[PDB]
């Protein structure tokens, strides 16, 4: 109900916590002279001041620091050379780790994964888990703010995980990072390349299909090459993830849900940066404008869609701030159930350059029935109103599919709607020009106020009547067609 | 029984309140570069530190600031350019807003009206709601110190609403400003021109035909052209409204 | 873990309950002389000693008898001629109805379905809802021992519904009888012919995929022609339904 932009703004400026008993551990002699040794990190070092257990209610395992979940542990190596591994720290409730490992390689997985969770006390604490390695090499799965066992007992509040290498944060092929309702993930290395299923937003509890389920992956500090490989937002709910990126964000396959959002936020142009009680100032930001050299190179946008039937659609969306929202050769997929699914590829202060086929149910035609109105949608440059939506591929719309483009100058290469019919080819948001190169219509609801279509094929619809090409608004004066060819 | 001249004189000089937890919100980057954007103000900015609910007794809706109705919220934009709107903040009990919007246009109505109410605790608090816009443009109805639901539960004490544009406070045709038993309304722009049914004094409760029902519209600071259009004092009782005008 | 043969054997021989305040209602004059009138049964007769409400926790609706869910209501018509209908008695927690309607037609659905649920107190009570009509004619859906709202608050214990016509218990096409973890259903007419989706065993809670979820449809007394049409056992769990049939 709040939205992502308020929830991230209230987690971005918090004092960490007030811990009594700040435990301190310093790795002494022995560690800093064997540069290949492949230590363990829990059992050889951390198990002194981290004690496991069993929680009654949601009973799987349990971990904290020492004498309750409100005690900070900080570890200060700063010279320990080797390669350390966690390998099995599951359901860590804990609170405020700090592992300072310069010139050390970490490894967050070996035969078992990790988890970093909190509990919902009356104090509403986070867990602020930090690592400061040199490489990180995730190499197995890692859940951030998971469910501990099953539902009951104590619930889970928010968390923050910060991974701060100085050479790169790679990942495995089967290393599923999966952060939930309250979790964030700060990365601060150079050249993050997560080759695994990053899963923002997930069913935290077994039946809570009406959870808000925010998340964040704040890769703002990454001075190199951010490279996701398979991002997956949302799972059986209305998740609203967000990425505060670093003006170069190549991703691979993106899989939204029916009603899932995404807010890839590029940086700005100059880069970032009794008795009364005065709370600290909560600086909060509305949707600004990304800088000039800010790119988001998504290369496939699928959409998973199954479940119930609602009186509307669900309108999966991704909202960008970047000056160039390129979309690569995989194009756009859109799965369609009985009601009409909808995709909103928005861009507030930028351009859109799609170079792929607008599929439906993973075929280029994509037939859909009358109640299933698969509605594509594009918004190039909403707030500045000078953004083009260039398509460099010959698109093809099947039956009961409705392309709409609300841009400043919607260039094209070719539209094929002669196949199925019932195609609301809306362009009412377009400011001036729609420079289509070739048009094929059967029963179309074209609404353009100014265009330049230098080839026009008008096809019939067999034997049925009442269905026709229909330029259903004011064409104005400056319009032009360099070739009409009825058949 | 006291008369208006004593009741206004005892509300004119009060220290505001003693709030613990003065929340502070500052509108940062993003707002101050789109001069036509038509934001929302509750959902985009204010909903962080204003949480609604349901009151048992006089049950319609419920709004406060954060953790009780004794917490001041102050918002400091001072450079956010645009045009903001409230549109539906009804039965705001709250306590001590402060919205500082220089070079910003407000709008107190879009498809729904507003309300600014208090509760009668044992401390007898006011709500001192402030706005500091550049135009205000009321544009739908606004009740000041209304009844929350129906009678029971907690009763309503006094309030103060201050609207402090620097270019003008116009209004719609159907924007019924209607302030009740304890409410005031300070205006400090130039050229107030309320083209709607200003309704000083109204039946706060459903049967209280013997209420005193004072009010005040202190347009003293208006350096321009005060211009009401349809003023309506009193409704089925002995209301004693008052206007502290500005010599025109 | 127990299996169906133990759970049915421990529900088959129970004394009903110990209710204080056995309310009694007798349909007097007026009902027994209009053989086609199409009464309502809740609003015209039963609403005297059945009062609805709202449960905090699993909040949809709430029904009981009078002053708590441990009070038996029994209704004794025995001569009221007509055709009565329930039409919307949803989430009836209640406890121990008894509707004795010889020479009367019932109808358990008209524009809305029915539900008959219990709560898990410390006494582990059933609800033993009875009807004794002449035809029954289900005609819309009927949940037995459903979930009240969503999960929280109070959980649901077992129940028993007994339908005891003397001419036949038919059903609609879209009348989904769906009995859950604790529910039974005794039928005692002749020629039961349920032409709807009988659904023994169902997800009582939203995520409990490891529930035992027993049920029973004890059609032992049916001296005629038992005739289901679409039986459906189990839903995303290890349900173990059972039917104590009548040799055809």
From Swiss-Prot, chains B, C:
Name recorded for this polypeptide: Vacuolating cytotoxin autotransporter
Main function: Induces vacuolation of eukaryotic cells. Causes ulceration and gastric lesions.
Source organism of the structure: Helicobacter pylori
Residues of the full protein shown: 60 to 307 of 1287
Domain notes: The signal peptide, cleaved at the inner membrane, guides the autotransporter protein to the periplasmic space. Then, insertion of the C-terminal translocator domain in the outer membrane forms a hydrophilic pore for the translocation of the passenger domain to the bacterial cell surface, with subsequent cleavage.
């Amino acid at each position: 109900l709040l939205g992502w932009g308020l929830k991230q703004a209230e987690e971005a400026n918090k004092t960490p916590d007030k811990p009594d008993k700040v435990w301190r551990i310093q790795a002494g002699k022995g560690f800093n002279e064997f540069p290949n040794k492949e230590y363990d990190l829990y059992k050889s070092l951390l198990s002194s001041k981290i004690d496991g257990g069993w929680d009654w209610g949601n009973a799987a395992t349990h971990y904290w620091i020492k004498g309750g979940q409100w005690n900070k542990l900080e570890v200060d190596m700063k010279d320990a050379v080797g390669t350390y591994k966690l390998s099995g720290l599951r359901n860590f409730t804990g609170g405020d780790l700090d592992v300072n490992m310069q010139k050390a390689t970490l490894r967050l997985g070996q035969f078992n994964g990790n988890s970093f969770t909190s509990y919902k006390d009356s104090a509403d604490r986070t867990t602020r888990v930090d690592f400061n390695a040199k490489n990180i090499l995730i190499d197995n799965f890692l859940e951030i703010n998971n469910r501990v066992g099953s539902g009951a007992g104590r619930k889970a509040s928010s968390t923050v995980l910060t991974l701060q290498a100085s050479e790169g944060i790679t990942s495995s092929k089967n290393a599923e990072i999966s952060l939930y309702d309250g979790a964030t993930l700060n990365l601060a290395s150079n050249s993050v390349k997560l080759n695994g299923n990053v899963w923002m937003g997930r069913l935290q509890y077994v039946g809570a299909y009406l959870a808000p389920s925010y998340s964040t992956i704040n890769t703002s500090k990454v001075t190199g090459e951010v490279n996701f490989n398979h991002l997956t937002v949302g799972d059986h709910n209305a998740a609203q993830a967000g990425i505060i990126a670093s003006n170069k964000t190549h991703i691979g396959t993106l899989d939204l849900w029916q009603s899932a959002g995404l807010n890839i936020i590029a940086p700005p142009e100059g880069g970032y940066k009794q008795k009364t009680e005065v709370q600290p100032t909560q600086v909060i930001d509305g949707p600004f404008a990304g800088g000039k050299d800010t790119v988001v190179n998504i290369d496939r946008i699928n959409t998973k869609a199954d479940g119930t039937i609602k009186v509307g659609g669900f309108k999966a969306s991704l909202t960008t701030n970047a000056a160039h929202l390129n979309i690569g050769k995989g194009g756009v997929n859109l799965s369609n159930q009985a009601s009409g699914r909808t995709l909103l590829v928005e861009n507030l202060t930028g351009n859109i350059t799609v170079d792929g086929p607008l599929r439906v149910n993973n075929q280029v035609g994509g037939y859909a029935l009358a109640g299933s109105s698969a509605n594509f949608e594009f918004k190039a440059g909403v707030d500045t109103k000078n953004g083009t939506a260039t398509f460099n591929n010959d698109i093809s719309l099947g039956r009961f599919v409705n392309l709409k483009v609300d841009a400043h100058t919607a260039n094209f290469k070719g539209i094929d709607t002669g196949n199925g019919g019932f195609n609301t080819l809306d362009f009412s948001g377009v400011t001036n020009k729609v420079n289509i190169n070739k048009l094929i219509t059967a029963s179309t609801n074209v609404a353009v106020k100014n265009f330049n279509i230098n080839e026009l094929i008008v096809k019939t619809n067999g034997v049925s009547v009442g269905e026709y090409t229909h330029f259903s608004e004011d064409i104005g004066s400056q319009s032009r067609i360099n070739t009409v060819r009825l058949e």
